[PDB]
Amino acid sequence: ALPALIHILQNSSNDGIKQLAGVEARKQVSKHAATQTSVKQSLLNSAFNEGKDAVRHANARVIASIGSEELDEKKWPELIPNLLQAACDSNPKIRETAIFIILSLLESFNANLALHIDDFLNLFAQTINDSASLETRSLSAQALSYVSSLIEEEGEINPQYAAKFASLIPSVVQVLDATIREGDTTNTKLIFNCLNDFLLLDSQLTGNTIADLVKLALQIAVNSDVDEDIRVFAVQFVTSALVYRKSKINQAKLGPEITLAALKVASEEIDVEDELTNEDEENTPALTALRLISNASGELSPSQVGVPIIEHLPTMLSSSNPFERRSILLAISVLVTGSPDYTLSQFDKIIPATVTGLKDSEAVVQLAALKCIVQLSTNLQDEVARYHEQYLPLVIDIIDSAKHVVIYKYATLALDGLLEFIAHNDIIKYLDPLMNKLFQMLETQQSPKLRAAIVSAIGSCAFAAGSGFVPYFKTSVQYLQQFIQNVSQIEGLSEDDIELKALTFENISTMGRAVKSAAFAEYAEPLVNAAYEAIKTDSARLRESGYAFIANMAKVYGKDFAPFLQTIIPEIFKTLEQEEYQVNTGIAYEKEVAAAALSELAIASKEHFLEYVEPSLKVLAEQVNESYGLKETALHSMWAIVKAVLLTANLKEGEYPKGVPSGSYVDASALAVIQTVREVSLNNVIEEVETSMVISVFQDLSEMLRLFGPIIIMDNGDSTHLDQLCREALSVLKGEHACQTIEDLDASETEATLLDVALDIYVALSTNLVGGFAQVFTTAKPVILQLCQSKSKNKRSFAVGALSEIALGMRDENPFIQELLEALIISLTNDKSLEVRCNASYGVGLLIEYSSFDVSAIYSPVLKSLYEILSVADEKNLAEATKEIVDRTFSNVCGCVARMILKHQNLVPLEHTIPALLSHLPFNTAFEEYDPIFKLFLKLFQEQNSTIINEAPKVIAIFATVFEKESERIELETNSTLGREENLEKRKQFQSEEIKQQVIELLKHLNQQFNGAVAQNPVLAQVIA
């Protein structure tokens, strides 16, 4: 039934047919009597005599598939011995076809080939250097990939084998050199695949080569004589080494050379007019390099990648080669994602640089700066926004005079991200001109790519402006209603046409968050019906926009939206169970938003969601096990369901009973939900090798414990899951967790974040358990104290900050105050980082406040350090370390000094300390530190202490600012867009209503004494009465 295909292969007069049958014959080898030997020989003659290689290869592959099958038992024992013979033949063409046939056998993966590893090692050790056929040398390198996989299959790596295999690696490098010299780009790529497979190998096979392979790929990548496609192979290889063997790169300190190599390739000339008008190649060297810098920034420490880029920013930005100006800007835009914190600290350099880019004559440079700004905004959202007064005029001017479509898109996109995060009070100055400009722009531009960018920017105005968007609400929906007609009719629409509708659905729902239910009522019903139309549509992008609309609806209507659950939850369920492979990115994005919608619905529906809890947790749990890209988000939504249940049971955030629970402060039904998700959370952290998975779980557990207490991790006196959680978290601190193991080493920002989120488990358990935390804290304490000594500035900062917060959780029930206080004083006194000393001073005051032993010996040294730290922040104030840090250091130092005066007034000489305190008041940030200062003011004035009594005018002025700031906060609280309450606690001036009343009561007393000084101030006269 099968032999037919072979005969066509031998005989067909037309030559292509011989080949076409060979392709089919190989496929049909497995299914398909005494003369199986006659068919073997006919193939071998054809495979060494046929004229043209393609037919030769066609014959050879059929032979190999036969050999693997005819190796159930010893059915063809001479095949491998004959091929080994022919590969040593004097005729180079005979050797070439022999190695080709051996390669096909190796491609069969027949388990019996492992019987021959030493044969292959000996043969390929010779044929790899064959001086007659470069093709034969390349096939031998290709063959070596399979031989290595065989030696690793063995129980124990044969040491003799791996020494032979590693000895061959320089030979493969010699082949790579040869193929590049002869221009055989087909084989150059194949050798690059061989180099890529070495990355995955066990270190015993590769020797110490991997670092030198990287060095060599960089030599190839930077050399512009080499063909473009070959250089891409080299950039990709180094990018591949960052993923699979960054430990080797670190050992060679290759990060900076990689960064600089990628920087030089990125500066090469590109097609300017294509960049400017062609709406999105990453197979040209300069673009591939940007992927290299991006991956380098994610995998390595900012000292290895970010610092080299910033050191070259001044010379490249002023270069007369616009492509060097363009490069450094795009280098920054790709650095920000993996090194956000490092990038933020360089804003004193980067913000002016982006401004210079916007001012450039060359549009390619202007486009780069805008891409940089976009990237910065996405990543460090409000930080970029604060510089709007410089940006907005510059970006508007570019929009007004743009000559290319891609500059217009990125200028609108840059405006979108800036406005999205501008403070509510600052947007008010601009809101009317922006609004009229955006709608003037929406009218002019008919390209759906440009209209989508404008609609998003308009939605960002509403988001920032909150209630201040009401005057524009009706006219905006009137206009935008046109882009959401015929939602169901998705045929005859382009991809950009789909996106313009989807963005309109999403940003109209953002307007409901800005102007709330009352001003949204006019259009609620038609818009919700259209959103359901989108959910049923065959466009995943369109369904995704529908779920986004509903999620924001949940925020607007709360329980009032509950009658819609019965229809919507089944549409969400269908979305979450979709098959995820075409991967179909639209479905991944749709699944993410549907999951957000399901979480938002659960929170809002309250009691009405209970009948959906079990089913929702069933669907979500399945996605954690089987979904390819939704595990973290799916697990997060389970915890959101838990939050919905616990709030429905009227467990109020932060109102849980402290200490290890002997039983449960939650009813049996809610406890069963918690235990379910608590079980899945531990299962996805234990022996988990995805660090993003471990981070996500630790974040969810931290947030849930802070909100609802130890019942999240423990109940009924059983601490099995608590011990597991700390066992895992302690592993991450030691650097010994599975996600880590694939001591002083320099760490990436992701690696450091992993450290911080594990510390956050301890910080949250200490507030949960108070004195009951001491037992659990005993193992981590030595590790964390050791981390306070790291060569890493962020690690020292994380540990000291976490020790300070742990102190706050344990309060006076902490049996280690003396030991912790001693460590933090060393940090306060000797650390070279202002940020580290900043966090240290907070813990020092807390520890002193909670100490019950004699601290008279440490007051004087600590106070001297506290005045010196006021000295290093003073100089910095006048002209690594940001202004935010400096201002926080003043707040924390003053809080620490106040806590000490409060604790042991007799030990502190007030005549000099009170003015130092006053001179740094009012605060600019860290208003939590007012709490001890208000308390100190209360006590000093109650004792009619002379030092404060003479300072009444400064004290009155401080409270004028405090109450002025407090009312501004209350106005912002009511007018803001729904759900932007990220920093609600941080802008609070008072830590409690009780202390706020004491300050008011103190202010009234101050009015009688000092004869109405208090009421002279309009702010305080209002609060006094």
Partner: peptide
């Protein structure tokens, strides 16, 4: 990881 600091319109 302590006092010094370490979602939006989109979904």
């Amino acid at each position: 990881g302590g006092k010094a600091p370490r979602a939006s319109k989109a979904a």
